[PDB]
Amino acid sequence: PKIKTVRGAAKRFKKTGKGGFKHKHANLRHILTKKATKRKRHLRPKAMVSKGDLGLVIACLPYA
Amino acid sequence: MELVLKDAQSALTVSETTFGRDFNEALVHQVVVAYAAGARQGTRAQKTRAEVTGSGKKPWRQKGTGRARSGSIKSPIWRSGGVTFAARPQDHSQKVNKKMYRGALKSILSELVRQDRLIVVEKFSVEAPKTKLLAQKLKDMALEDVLIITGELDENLFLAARNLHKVDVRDATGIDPVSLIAFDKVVMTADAVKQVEEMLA
Amino acid sequence: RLNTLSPAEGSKKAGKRLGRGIGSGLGKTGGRGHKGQKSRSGGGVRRGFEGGQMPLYRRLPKFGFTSRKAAITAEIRLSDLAKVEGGVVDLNTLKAANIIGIQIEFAKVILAGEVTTPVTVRGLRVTKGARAAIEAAGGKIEE
Amino acid sequence: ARVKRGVIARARHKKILKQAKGYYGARSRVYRVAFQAVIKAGQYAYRDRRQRKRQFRQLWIARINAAARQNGISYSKFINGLKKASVEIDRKILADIAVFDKVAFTALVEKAKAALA
RNA sequence: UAGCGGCGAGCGAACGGGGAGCAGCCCAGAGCCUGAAUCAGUGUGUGUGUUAGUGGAAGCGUCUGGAAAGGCGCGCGAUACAGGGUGACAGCCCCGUACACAAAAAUGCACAUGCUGUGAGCUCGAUGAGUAGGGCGGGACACGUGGUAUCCUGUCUGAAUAUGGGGGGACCAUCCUCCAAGGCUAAAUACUCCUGACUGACCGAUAGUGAACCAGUACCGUGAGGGAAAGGCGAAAAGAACCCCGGCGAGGGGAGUGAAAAAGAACCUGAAACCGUGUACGUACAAGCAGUGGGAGCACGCUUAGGCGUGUGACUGCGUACCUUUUGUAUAAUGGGUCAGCGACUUAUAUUCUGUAGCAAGGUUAACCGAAUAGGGGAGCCGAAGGGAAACCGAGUCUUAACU
């Protein structure tokens, strides 16, 4: 066989220039009027997947 | 570089990159092991537990006999039972890169020149298709174990070397690493030398 | 000399054989510890499985879409276009030089190093820096 | 390439059973018991290459203590005496002189009492 | 990969590219015109193949040996040194192999040809209706009804018919492309009950078929069904005339054959467990993982007594098996009566890292063609450029009205 991508991980991480993975932050979909604008403004840019989790991500995304 | 002809006493001008480079023993070893691996007809199969001619009936009840628990009479622990990791027919070919194959031929040709196992004759043909004539001809040239390689495959030479054990006649196209290394002396026609340089660039 | 050829030093590493004896290092448990799901034949959990905690690829939101059009755009360096056989650059003349691909419809002439010959670029987008680099080394860009 | 394993297994078993000649019963006949007997003999042999140094030393001390008390001094006072007399004869040799040469041992006791006083 | 997906687990295309192979036609329909290509069915002739076959090279002496093909010495064949047998290992002893030939008869294939059937070609016309589409239910499409195109239809309906209709992924318009509701069609392709030849870093009698042997047998089961074990004397039966013990036995001892009968049919080798006979030593006042360290004596061999070696081992210090599981086992926790044979980290394909080898801003081909492990084949893949959700920009880019 040929390795299948964990497909719902491809919709959530995207590869960068030096091999790290970017992802959208959690907590910014609903319940929102209770949150400060400082939270929400700091959750909008995309973020790098941390060191702990790259193992998991590279396992799920073997072609990206 | 020049190759001294045996009979005409000329010198054939060759490439130093083809007939005068170093012996890369690791490269040659990879191409030799790969050539020999390509020859394996990998035909075999043992029967796994699934293919052994039996039944899937469980031989005794799971509990209460004092026997060890068993589930199939085709278990690999049982006599008559089915190989655990039974083999299948497999392909043993290795990829050799083209530049590694050509590199290996350049190394072995350079060492056949360097060890005086490479003889360059101008013409090498037999009169009639007789093994007696080729036996006498190789006897006159002090050669017993020999790989004759000719740029144009003569029919009579091919029929004359077909019974001689140590002797093998090839065209310049179909040479392999294991025969240049296998045979004691290689006798190339000058035309075969030119065709070899055209092959190996 | 087929019994004198020998591989390189370091190329053929041995291969772990598990389950043979005490001296070998990997006998009884073969290097897989005591009981558990991981010491079992077939045993192991699936990819991105954190016990039952919601996995990383499933507690983070999904973003974006795939373009359809970025799969037919290309990106030409300046190291090529000395490779086009002609000194004239269109989408064909690049396709013919095995440099973009047949499905490609859009191309762009990014500064990525060292154009020398005078090249006439036709119908391709060119970046700013590479417009200066094509026009500086003779060159011509029309569209 | 099927490898039958009869000949080499026979050689290993036989190696172990030759190392167990003289053992009682199955310990010298059956492989599965002679293997344990041979190993336990190995562990004892290790352990006892250390104990023979301890056992010989306590034998020698008992003989020097006997012969020295025969010459009117204890072992403790005799070794203190000879160390103060700066005699470095070890006690294998003092035990052996104390058996074979009674007069030399008497003279050693005189050095010990001479320095000890 | 795009996508589908309790957007989970998973499922997973097409476009387009490279190859293998390549072949188009007929009816719905009349007239002109006929046998005009076409195939099908048969006869005959030729060629080739199958079903029996034929010829097929070239050696002797001497030594060991039961026996020579082996050793040594000297010759010959080879378009034939593939293989098998022959009293040990044979190119030249035998069967064969290379090579060259062979069919009265029956046949397969391919041309040619006779007859029958069949219809070419031209002009004009027609150009597939309960159908396409729709509503409801379901299914197939990678696509789970979703914004879902498309196909199939169980049910209810229902057109236009070349100034027409289908598709182009909801849908409309413009543009492009194609002609459903009739049918036939070789090759590339898949498979091996069965036959022949050849091959194996496949097995060698607990393996390989369940089955090397009168094996799907014996045997088990009412039945469907399940399903064994079991090969090897010798080169040749020359397989033991005859005599003795013995129950006109069984078994044996001689004799004889044989190179060898502890090669005798319970037959090559002949292990281990297990059981004996004989010899040396120890052992009947001594407590326990049965050894180990020390160690007297005795018996055999030596040995220019050199005071060693082998066997035994009184007596003595120390010493509660192995596995497994466990915080922890002499544990009175698990497992094992013993021996012998078998018995468990493999294989394939992807991806990542390390070693190593080639080439290097390049590396490499896949299918396939194939003088065929060569060489072609660069379709493609990976890398040399990133940023952004994306358009887009590009050594920058995104954010933001703009960024110290």
Short mmCIF file of N, CA, C and O in Angstrom, two decimals, chain D:
data_model
loop_
_atom_site.label_atom_id
_atom_site.label_comp_id
_atom_site.label_asym_id
_atom_site.label_seq_id
_atom_site.Cartn_x
_atom_site.Cartn_y
_atom_site.Cartn_z
N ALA D 1 15.49 -21.50 2.05
CA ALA D 1 16.62 -22.20 2.78
C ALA D 1 16.16 -22.63 4.16
O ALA D 1 16.24 -21.89 5.15
N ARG D 2 15.64 -23.84 4.23
CA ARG D 2 15.24 -24.41 5.51
C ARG D 2 16.50 -24.93 6.14
O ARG D 2 17.33 -25.61 5.50
N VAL D 3 16.64 -24.62 7.41
CA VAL D 3 17.77 -25.05 8.20
C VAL D 3 17.24 -26.02 9.23
O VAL D 3 16.42 -25.67 10.06
N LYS D 4 17.66 -27.27 9.12
CA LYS D 4 17.43 -28.23 10.19
C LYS D 4 18.44 -27.96 11.25
O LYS D 4 19.60 -27.54 10.97
N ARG D 5 18.03 -28.27 12.48
CA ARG D 5 18.83 -27.85 13.62
C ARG D 5 19.21 -28.95 14.55
O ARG D 5 19.36 -28.70 15.71
N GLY D 6 19.44 -30.13 13.98
CA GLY D 6 19.66 -31.34 14.78
C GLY D 6 21.05 -31.45 15.22
O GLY D 6 21.30 -31.75 16.37
N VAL D 7 21.96 -31.20 14.31
CA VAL D 7 23.38 -31.47 14.56
C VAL D 7 23.99 -30.45 15.55
O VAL D 7 24.69 -30.88 16.52
N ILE D 8 23.64 -29.18 15.36
CA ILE D 8 24.13 -28.17 16.31
C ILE D 8 23.51 -28.17 17.72
O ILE D 8 24.20 -27.90 18.73
N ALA D 9 22.25 -28.52 17.78
CA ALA D 9 21.58 -28.76 19.06
C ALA D 9 22.13 -29.94 19.79
O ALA D 9 22.24 -29.90 21.10
N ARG D 10 22.49 -30.97 19.04
CA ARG D 10 23.09 -32.08 19.66
C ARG D 10 24.45 -31.69 20.27
O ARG D 10 24.91 -32.25 21.30
N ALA D 11 25.18 -30.82 19.57
CA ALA D 11 26.48 -30.43 20.03
C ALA D 11 26.38 -29.58 21.29
O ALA D 11 27.28 -29.66 22.17
N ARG D 12 25.36 -28.72 21.41
CA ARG D 12 25.27 -27.88 22.60
C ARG D 12 24.89 -28.72 23.77
O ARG D 12 25.49 -28.57 24.88
N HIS D 13 23.87 -29.55 23.61
CA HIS D 13 23.44 -30.41 24.70
C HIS D 13 24.59 -31.29 25.19
O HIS D 13 24.70 -31.56 26.40
N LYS D 14 25.35 -31.84 24.27
CA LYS D 14 26.43 -32.69 24.62
C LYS D 14 27.54 -31.96 25.37
O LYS D 14 28.19 -32.54 26.26
N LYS D 15 27.80 -30.73 24.99
CA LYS D 15 28.76 -29.86 25.69
C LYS D 15 28.41 -29.70 27.17
O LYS D 15 29.29 -29.91 28.07
N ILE D 16 27.13 -29.39 27.42
CA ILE D 16 26.63 -29.24 28.79
C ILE D 16 26.67 -30.56 29.56
O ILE D 16 27.12 -30.60 30.66
N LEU D 17 26.31 -31.66 28.94
CA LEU D 17 26.30 -32.91 29.64
C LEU D 17 27.66 -33.44 29.88
O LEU D 17 27.86 -34.32 30.73
N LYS D 18 28.66 -33.06 29.08
CA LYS D 18 30.03 -33.45 29.42
C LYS D 18 30.46 -32.61 30.64
O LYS D 18 31.22 -33.03 31.45
N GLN D 19 30.02 -31.40 30.77
CA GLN D 19 30.42 -30.60 31.96
C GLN D 19 29.73 -31.05 33.22
O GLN D 19 29.96 -30.48 34.28
N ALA D 20 28.83 -32.01 33.14
CA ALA D 20 28.12 -32.53 34.32
C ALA D 20 28.37 -33.99 34.59
O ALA D 20 27.45 -34.66 34.79
N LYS D 21 29.61 -34.50 34.46
CA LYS D 21 29.84 -35.91 34.65
C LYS D 21 29.97 -35.97 36.17
O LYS D 21 30.55 -35.06 36.83
N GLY D 22 29.52 -37.06 36.74
CA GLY D 22 29.72 -37.25 38.12
C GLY D 22 28.60 -36.72 38.99
O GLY D 22 28.66 -36.96 40.22
N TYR D 23 27.61 -36.06 38.42
CA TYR D 23 26.54 -35.58 39.20
C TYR D 23 25.54 -36.68 39.45
O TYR D 23 25.34 -37.49 38.59
N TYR D 24 24.81 -36.63 40.56
CA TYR D 24 23.80 -37.64 40.89
C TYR D 24 22.55 -37.58 40.09
O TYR D 24 21.92 -36.53 40.01
N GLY D 25 22.23 -38.70 39.42
CA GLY D 25 20.91 -38.98 38.79
C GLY D 25 20.75 -38.15 37.59
O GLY D 25 21.69 -38.09 36.74
N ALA D 26 19.60 -37.51 37.47
CA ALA D 26 19.29 -36.77 36.27
C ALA D 26 20.25 -35.66 36.01
O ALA D 26 20.37 -35.23 34.80
N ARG D 27 20.92 -35.19 37.07
CA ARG D 27 21.87 -34.10 36.97
C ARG D 27 22.98 -34.41 36.00
O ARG D 27 23.71 -33.49 35.64
N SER D 28 23.20 -35.69 35.69
CA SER D 28 24.23 -36.10 34.73
C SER D 28 23.68 -36.76 33.53
O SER D 28 24.46 -37.13 32.64
N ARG D 29 22.35 -36.92 33.43
CA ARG D 29 21.78 -37.63 32.29
C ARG D 29 20.88 -36.70 31.47
O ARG D 29 20.89 -36.75 30.26
N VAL D 30 20.00 -36.01 32.13
CA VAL D 30 18.96 -35.29 31.47
C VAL D 30 19.49 -33.87 31.22
O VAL D 30 20.08 -33.25 32.15
N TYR D 31 19.30 -33.37 29.97
CA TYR D 31 19.80 -32.01 29.71
C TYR D 31 19.20 -30.92 30.47
O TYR D 31 19.79 -29.94 30.91
N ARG D 32 17.98 -31.09 30.72
CA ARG D 32 17.19 -29.99 31.25
C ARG D 32 17.49 -29.76 32.74
O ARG D 32 17.16 -28.75 33.25
N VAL D 33 18.07 -30.75 33.39
CA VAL D 33 18.49 -30.68 34.77
C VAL D 33 20.02 -30.48 34.85
O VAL D 33 20.50 -29.73 35.74
N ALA D 34 20.77 -31.06 33.89
CA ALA D 34 22.16 -30.81 33.86
C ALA D 34 22.49 -29.43 33.47
O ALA D 34 23.57 -29.00 33.87
N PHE D 35 21.65 -28.68 32.75
CA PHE D 35 21.93 -27.31 32.49
C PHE D 35 21.91 -26.51 33.80
O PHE D 35 22.84 -25.67 34.08
N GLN D 36 20.90 -26.71 34.64
CA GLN D 36 20.82 -25.99 35.89
C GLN D 36 21.94 -26.39 36.80
O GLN D 36 22.38 -25.52 37.64
N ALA D 37 22.34 -27.67 36.77
CA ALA D 37 23.40 -28.10 37.65
C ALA D 37 24.74 -27.49 37.26
O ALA D 37 25.59 -27.17 38.13
N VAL D 38 24.96 -27.36 35.97
CA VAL D 38 26.18 -26.81 35.48
C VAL D 38 26.25 -25.33 35.77
O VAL D 38 27.31 -24.75 36.09
N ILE D 39 25.17 -24.64 35.67
CA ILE D 39 25.21 -23.21 35.99
C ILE D 39 25.40 -22.97 37.46
O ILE D 39 26.20 -22.13 37.82
N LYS D 40 24.68 -23.69 38.29
CA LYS D 40 24.78 -23.50 39.72
C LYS D 40 26.18 -23.89 40.17
O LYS D 40 26.72 -23.28 41.11
N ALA D 41 26.81 -24.86 39.53
CA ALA D 41 28.21 -25.16 39.79
C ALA D 41 29.12 -24.03 39.38
O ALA D 41 30.17 -23.83 40.02
N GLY D 42 28.76 -23.30 38.33
CA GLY D 42 29.52 -22.12 37.91
C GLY D 42 29.46 -21.02 38.91
O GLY D 42 30.50 -20.37 39.20
N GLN D 43 28.30 -20.77 39.48
CA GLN D 43 28.12 -19.71 40.47
C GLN D 43 28.79 -20.02 41.73
O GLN D 43 29.44 -19.10 42.34
N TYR D 44 28.70 -21.30 42.16
CA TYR D 44 29.46 -21.72 43.32
C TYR D 44 30.94 -21.61 43.10
O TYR D 44 31.69 -21.37 44.03
N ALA D 45 31.43 -21.89 41.89
CA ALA D 45 32.86 -21.90 41.65
C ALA D 45 33.44 -20.55 41.70
O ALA D 45 34.60 -20.37 42.18
N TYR D 46 32.67 -19.57 41.26
CA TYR D 46 33.02 -18.16 41.36
C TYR D 46 33.15 -17.73 42.83
O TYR D 46 34.25 -17.35 43.29
N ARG D 47 32.06 -17.90 43.54
CA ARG D 47 31.90 -17.60 44.94
C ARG D 47 33.03 -18.22 45.76
O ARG D 47 33.51 -17.61 46.73
N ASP D 48 33.49 -19.42 45.41
CA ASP D 48 34.46 -20.13 46.16
C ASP D 48 35.81 -19.87 45.77
O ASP D 48 36.81 -20.26 46.54
N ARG D 49 36.03 -19.30 44.58
CA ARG D 49 37.40 -18.72 44.31
C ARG D 49 37.62 -17.56 45.21
O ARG D 49 38.75 -17.30 45.44
N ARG D 50 36.58 -16.90 45.76
CA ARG D 50 36.81 -15.87 46.82
C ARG D 50 36.91 -16.47 48.18
O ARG D 50 37.83 -16.11 48.97
N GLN D 51 36.01 -17.40 48.48
CA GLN D 51 36.09 -18.04 49.79
C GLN D 51 37.35 -18.86 50.03
O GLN D 51 37.58 -19.22 51.19
N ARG D 52 38.08 -19.30 49.01
CA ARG D 52 39.23 -20.09 49.39
C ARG D 52 40.32 -19.20 49.95
O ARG D 52 41.16 -19.62 50.76
N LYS D 53 40.28 -17.95 49.62
CA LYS D 53 41.23 -17.00 50.17
C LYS D 53 40.89 -16.70 51.59
O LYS D 53 41.76 -16.62 52.48
N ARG D 54 39.60 -16.56 51.86
CA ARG D 54 39.13 -16.37 53.25
C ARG D 54 39.41 -17.64 54.10
O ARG D 54 39.92 -17.49 55.20
N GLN D 55 39.14 -18.85 53.60
CA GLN D 55 39.26 -20.06 54.36
C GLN D 55 40.66 -20.41 54.66
O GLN D 55 40.98 -20.95 55.76
N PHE D 56 41.52 -20.18 53.70
CA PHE D 56 42.98 -20.47 53.92
C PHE D 56 43.52 -19.51 54.89
O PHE D 56 44.37 -19.92 55.68
N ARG D 57 43.06 -18.27 54.87
CA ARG D 57 43.59 -17.32 55.84
C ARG D 57 43.18 -17.67 57.22
O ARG D 57 44.00 -17.56 58.15
N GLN D 58 41.95 -18.10 57.43
CA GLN D 58 41.56 -18.49 58.77
C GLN D 58 42.21 -19.80 59.26
O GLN D 58 42.44 -19.98 60.48
N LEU D 59 42.60 -20.64 58.34
CA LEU D 59 43.37 -21.81 58.71
C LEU D 59 44.75 -21.44 59.19
O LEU D 59 45.24 -21.99 60.22
N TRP D 60 45.40 -20.54 58.47
CA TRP D 60 46.73 -20.14 58.83
C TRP D 60 46.72 -19.42 60.16
O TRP D 60 47.63 -19.55 60.96
N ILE D 61 45.72 -18.60 60.40
CA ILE D 61 45.66 -17.89 61.64
C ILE D 61 45.47 -18.88 62.76
O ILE D 61 46.02 -18.73 63.85
N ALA D 62 44.74 -19.93 62.56
CA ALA D 62 44.56 -20.89 63.65
C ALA D 62 45.87 -21.65 63.95
O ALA D 62 46.16 -21.96 65.09
N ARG D 63 46.65 -21.96 62.94
CA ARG D 63 47.91 -22.61 63.18
C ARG D 63 48.98 -21.76 63.81
O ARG D 63 49.77 -22.29 64.63
N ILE D 64 49.05 -20.48 63.46
CA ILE D 64 50.00 -19.57 64.09
C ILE D 64 49.53 -19.29 65.50
O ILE D 64 50.34 -19.10 66.41
N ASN D 65 48.24 -19.26 65.71
CA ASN D 65 47.73 -19.03 67.04
C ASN D 65 48.06 -20.25 67.95
O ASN D 65 48.43 -20.11 69.12
N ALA D 66 48.00 -21.43 67.39
CA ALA D 66 48.34 -22.64 68.16
C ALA D 66 49.80 -22.71 68.48
O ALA D 66 50.16 -22.93 69.62
N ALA D 67 50.64 -22.55 67.47
CA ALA D 67 52.06 -22.65 67.69
C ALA D 67 52.64 -21.48 68.55
O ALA D 67 53.58 -21.65 69.35
N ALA D 68 52.07 -20.31 68.38
CA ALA D 68 52.49 -19.20 69.16
C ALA D 68 52.09 -19.32 70.59
O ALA D 68 52.86 -18.93 71.48
N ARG D 69 50.90 -19.86 70.87
CA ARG D 69 50.53 -20.16 72.28
C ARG D 69 51.32 -21.30 72.84
O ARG D 69 51.47 -21.43 74.01
N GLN D 70 51.80 -22.18 72.00
CA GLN D 70 52.76 -23.19 72.42
C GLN D 70 54.06 -22.52 72.86
O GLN D 70 54.74 -23.04 73.71
N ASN D 71 54.42 -21.41 72.25
CA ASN D 71 55.60 -20.62 72.70
C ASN D 71 55.23 -19.49 73.63
O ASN D 71 55.97 -18.50 73.70
N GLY D 72 54.10 -19.59 74.30
CA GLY D 72 53.79 -18.63 75.34
C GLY D 72 53.40 -17.21 74.96
O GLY D 72 53.71 -16.29 75.69
N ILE D 73 52.69 -17.02 73.87
CA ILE D 73 52.15 -15.69 73.50
C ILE D 73 50.95 -15.94 72.61
O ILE D 73 50.84 -16.95 71.93
N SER D 74 49.97 -15.06 72.62
CA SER D 74 48.82 -15.26 71.72
C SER D 74 49.13 -14.80 70.32
O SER D 74 50.17 -14.26 70.04
N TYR D 75 48.24 -15.08 69.42
CA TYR D 75 48.32 -14.62 68.03
C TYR D 75 48.28 -13.13 67.90
O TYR D 75 49.05 -12.58 67.13
N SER D 76 47.40 -12.47 68.63
CA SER D 76 47.22 -11.05 68.58
C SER D 76 48.52 -10.34 68.96
O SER D 76 49.00 -9.42 68.20
N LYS D 77 49.11 -10.75 70.10
CA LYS D 77 50.35 -10.16 70.57
C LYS D 77 51.52 -10.53 69.65
O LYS D 77 52.50 -9.82 69.57
N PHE D 78 51.44 -11.66 68.97
CA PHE D 78 52.55 -12.11 68.13
C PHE D 78 52.58 -11.30 66.89
O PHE D 78 53.67 -10.92 66.43
N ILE D 79 51.42 -11.05 66.27
CA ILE D 79 51.40 -10.25 65.05
C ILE D 79 51.73 -8.81 65.36
O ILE D 79 52.42 -8.18 64.52
N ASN D 80 51.25 -8.27 66.50
CA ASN D 80 51.65 -6.93 66.88
C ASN D 80 53.16 -6.87 67.05
O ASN D 80 53.79 -5.85 66.66
N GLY D 81 53.75 -7.92 67.67
CA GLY D 81 55.17 -7.95 67.94
C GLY D 81 55.93 -7.92 66.66
O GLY D 81 56.91 -7.18 66.54
N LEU D 82 55.55 -8.76 65.70
CA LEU D 82 56.33 -8.85 64.47
C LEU D 82 56.15 -7.60 63.60
O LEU D 82 57.04 -7.26 62.82
N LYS D 83 55.00 -6.96 63.68
CA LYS D 83 54.83 -5.73 62.95
C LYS D 83 55.73 -4.65 63.60
O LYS D 83 56.36 -3.88 62.91
N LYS D 84 55.73 -4.53 64.92
CA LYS D 84 56.69 -3.63 65.60
C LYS D 84 58.15 -4.03 65.42
O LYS D 84 59.01 -3.17 65.42
N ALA D 85 58.43 -5.32 65.30
CA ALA D 85 59.80 -5.78 64.97
C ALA D 85 60.11 -5.58 63.48
O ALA D 85 61.15 -5.98 63.04
N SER D 86 59.15 -5.07 62.73
CA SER D 86 59.26 -4.78 61.32
C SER D 86 59.55 -6.03 60.47
O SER D 86 60.26 -5.95 59.52
N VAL D 87 58.95 -7.16 60.83
CA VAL D 87 59.00 -8.37 60.07
C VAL D 87 57.75 -8.43 59.17
O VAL D 87 56.60 -8.22 59.61
N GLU D 88 57.97 -8.69 57.88
CA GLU D 88 56.89 -8.68 56.90
C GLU D 88 56.58 -10.04 56.36
O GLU D 88 56.06 -10.10 55.24
N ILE D 89 56.80 -11.11 57.13
CA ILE D 89 56.47 -12.44 56.67
C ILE D 89 54.96 -12.62 56.74
O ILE D 89 54.37 -12.42 57.82
N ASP D 90 54.34 -12.98 55.62
CA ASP D 90 52.88 -13.21 55.60
C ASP D 90 52.56 -14.51 56.25
O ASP D 90 53.46 -15.30 56.61
N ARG D 91 51.28 -14.78 56.41
CA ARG D 91 50.90 -15.78 57.35
C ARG D 91 50.63 -17.14 56.78
O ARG D 91 50.47 -18.12 57.51
N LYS D 92 50.64 -17.23 55.48
CA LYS D 92 50.89 -18.54 54.82
C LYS D 92 52.23 -19.11 55.25
O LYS D 92 52.34 -20.28 55.64
N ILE D 93 53.27 -18.29 55.17
CA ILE D 93 54.60 -18.73 55.45
C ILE D 93 54.78 -18.94 56.95
O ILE D 93 55.47 -19.88 57.38
N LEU D 94 54.15 -18.10 57.77
CA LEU D 94 54.26 -18.30 59.24
C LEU D 94 53.54 -19.55 59.67
O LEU D 94 53.99 -20.22 60.62
N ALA D 95 52.42 -19.86 59.00
CA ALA D 95 51.78 -21.14 59.28
C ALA D 95 52.64 -22.35 58.84
O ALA D 95 52.68 -23.38 59.54
N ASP D 96 53.36 -22.20 57.71
CA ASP D 96 54.12 -23.27 57.15
C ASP D 96 55.41 -23.52 57.92
O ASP D 96 55.83 -24.69 58.09
N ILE D 97 56.08 -22.44 58.35
CA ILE D 97 57.21 -22.55 59.26
C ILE D 97 56.72 -23.14 60.58
O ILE D 97 57.39 -23.99 61.16
N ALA D 98 55.55 -22.71 61.06
CA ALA D 98 55.02 -23.16 62.36
C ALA D 98 54.72 -24.64 62.36
O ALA D 98 54.80 -25.29 63.42
N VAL D 99 54.44 -25.20 61.19
CA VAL D 99 54.34 -26.67 61.08
C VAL D 99 55.71 -27.33 60.89
O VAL D 99 56.08 -28.20 61.67
N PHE D 100 56.48 -26.87 59.91
CA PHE D 100 57.68 -27.61 59.46
C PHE D 100 58.95 -27.29 60.22
O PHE D 100 59.79 -28.17 60.39
N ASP D 101 59.10 -26.07 60.70
CA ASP D 101 60.32 -25.65 61.36
C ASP D 101 59.99 -25.00 62.69
O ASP D 101 59.74 -23.80 62.78
N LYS D 102 60.00 -25.80 63.74
CA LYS D 102 59.62 -25.34 65.08
C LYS D 102 60.66 -24.38 65.68
O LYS D 102 60.35 -23.50 66.47
N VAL D 103 61.91 -24.54 65.28
CA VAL D 103 62.99 -23.73 65.83
C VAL D 103 62.98 -22.32 65.24
O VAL D 103 63.16 -21.32 65.96
N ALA D 104 62.72 -22.23 63.94
CA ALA D 104 62.54 -20.92 63.28
C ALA D 104 61.34 -20.18 63.80
O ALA D 104 61.35 -18.95 63.93
N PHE D 105 60.29 -20.91 64.10
CA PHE D 105 59.11 -20.28 64.68
C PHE D 105 59.36 -19.81 66.07
O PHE D 105 58.80 -18.78 66.49
N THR D 106 60.16 -20.57 66.81
CA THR D 106 60.58 -20.14 68.15
C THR D 106 61.38 -18.84 68.10
O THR D 106 61.16 -17.92 68.91
N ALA D 107 62.24 -18.72 67.11
CA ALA D 107 63.02 -17.51 66.94
C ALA D 107 62.18 -16.29 66.51
O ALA D 107 62.49 -15.13 66.90
N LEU D 108 61.15 -16.55 65.68
CA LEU D 108 60.22 -15.51 65.33
C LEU D 108 59.43 -15.04 66.57
O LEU D 108 59.13 -13.84 66.70
N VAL D 109 59.10 -15.97 67.46
CA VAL D 109 58.43 -15.60 68.68
C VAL D 109 59.36 -14.80 69.57
O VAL D 109 58.92 -13.87 70.28
N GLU D 110 60.65 -15.08 69.49
CA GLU D 110 61.61 -14.28 70.27
C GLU D 110 61.79 -12.87 69.74
O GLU D 110 62.01 -11.96 70.54
N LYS D 111 61.69 -12.70 68.42
CA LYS D 111 61.68 -11.33 67.86
C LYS D 111 60.42 -10.59 68.26
O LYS D 111 60.46 -9.40 68.55
N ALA D 112 59.30 -11.29 68.28
CA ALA D 112 58.04 -10.66 68.61
C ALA D 112 58.01 -10.24 70.08
O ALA D 112 57.51 -9.17 70.40
N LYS D 113 58.49 -11.10 70.98
CA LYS D 113 58.51 -10.74 72.39
C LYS D 113 59.58 -9.70 72.66
O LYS D 113 59.44 -8.90 73.60
N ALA D 114 60.66 -9.73 71.86
CA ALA D 114 61.75 -8.77 72.04
C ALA D 114 61.29 -7.36 71.69
O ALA D 114 61.56 -6.41 72.43
N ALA D 115 60.61 -7.20 70.56
CA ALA D 115 60.08 -5.90 70.17
C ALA D 115 58.84 -5.50 70.92
O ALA D 115 58.52 -4.32 71.01
N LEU D 116 58.09 -6.47 71.41
CA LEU D 116 56.81 -6.18 72.04
C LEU D 116 57.00 -5.67 73.47
O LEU D 116 56.19 -4.88 73.95
N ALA D 117 58.08 -6.10 74.12
CA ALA D 117 58.46 -5.61 75.43
C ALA D 117 59.03 -4.17 75.33
O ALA D 117 60.21 -3.96 75.03
#
